[PDB]
Design a protein around this ligand. Structure first.
Ligand SMILES: CCC(=O)Nc1ccc(OC)c(Nc2cc(-c3[nH]c(SC)nc3-c3ccc(F)cc3)ccn2)c1
Length: 286
């Protein structure tokens, strides 16, 4: 009784896009930034392009998920290119991932931005729940920054249609159970990363110890800038009983209320010829 997945997988010609600069390398391969110019369309779209063995098959699983999502707070695929290498093409997020962003700008991030990011990540996660998708790797390193006002969830390699130990619910560490409510646990840790301006959770504690610590009842500490109102929401995401944790739709509501009066809730010290360039969010295909 599942609905047909009528997402469209677009195949792009290598001549349609121009790589400009490398952004990073590693195990997966090399991520470039460039411009995509569709065939005869009078537009230039800034893009990230992610360029030998069965690794072939999880890049395609990631393409499958990214083609099946459409929401302002989730990164979606523009297409794939089947050259000698398989390339994934997506909207360029020029400010990088949110974890590095908060680390590089600790002294310039006010309460309004922090709480707005919390609302947007919950919106993206609630949409994934609507689509019955469990992310399984939510973390601040997996949130990309389009502008400082607009972030999007990314990295769907581990997503399933219903290990990073320090972001995992207890029931996933113990029994490899993953639900939308185990995603809520990881949302709590991601919020903790933002509120501590990018600190490492359980810094210095070996991952083999996390299950015992969590079972004895310990959790991440209250960040200095957080009122008890914000910290209590994080703690609720870390309940042992998964069904007593908040729903993403409720996390949207709670952080939205706090975003209307941000300083009551976070206490922060001092708180090119691009003529036919179009952002991918304004490039809509039927
Ligand atoms: C390691 C974390 C990281 O990438 N930070 C970072 C730093 C600087 C940047 O400069 C603009 C960007 N921009 C950026 C990066 C990606 C990105 N990244 C990575 S990494 C494995 N795959 C992709 C990616 C994923 C799917 C695609 F179909 C195409 C690309 C997507 C969009 N935009 C990102």
């Amino acid at each position: 009784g599942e609905a047909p997945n009528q997402a469209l997988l677009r195949i792009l010609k290598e001549t349609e896009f121009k790589k400009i600069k490398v952004l990073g390398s590693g195990a997966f391969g090399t991520v470039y930034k460039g411009l995509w110019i569709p065939e005869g369309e009078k537009v230039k779209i800034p893009v990230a392009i992610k360029e030998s063995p069965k690794a072939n098959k999880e890049i395609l699983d990631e393409a499958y998920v990214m083609a099946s999502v459409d929401n302002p707070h989730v990164c979606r695929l523009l297409g794939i290119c089947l050259t000698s290498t398989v390339q994934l093409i997506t909207q360029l997020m020029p400010f990088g991932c949110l974890l590095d962003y908060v680390r590089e700008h600790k002294d310039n991030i006010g309460s309004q931005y922090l709480l707005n990011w919390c609302v947007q990540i919950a919106k993206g996660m609630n949409y994934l729940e609507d689509r019955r998708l469990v992310h399984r790797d939510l973390a601040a390193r997996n949130v990309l920054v389009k502008t400082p006002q607009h972030v999007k969830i990314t990295d769907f390699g581990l997503a399933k249609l219903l290990v990073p130990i320090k972001w995992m619910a207890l029931e996933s560490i113990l029994h490899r159970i993953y639900t939308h409510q185990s995603d809520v646990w990881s949302y709590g840790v991601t919020v903790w990363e933002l509120m501590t301006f990018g600190s490492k959770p359980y810094d210095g504690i070996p991952a083999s110890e996390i299950s015992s610590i969590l079972e004895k009842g310990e959790r991440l500490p209250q960040p200095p800038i957080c009122t008890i109102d914000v910290y209590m929401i994080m703690v609720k995401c870390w309940m042992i009983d998964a069904d007593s944790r908040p729903k993403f739709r409720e996390l949207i509501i709670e952080f939205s209320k706090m975003a209307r009066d941000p300083q009551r809730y976070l206490v922060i010290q001092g708180d090119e010829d691009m003529d036919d360039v179009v952002d991918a969010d304004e490039y809509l295909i039927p």
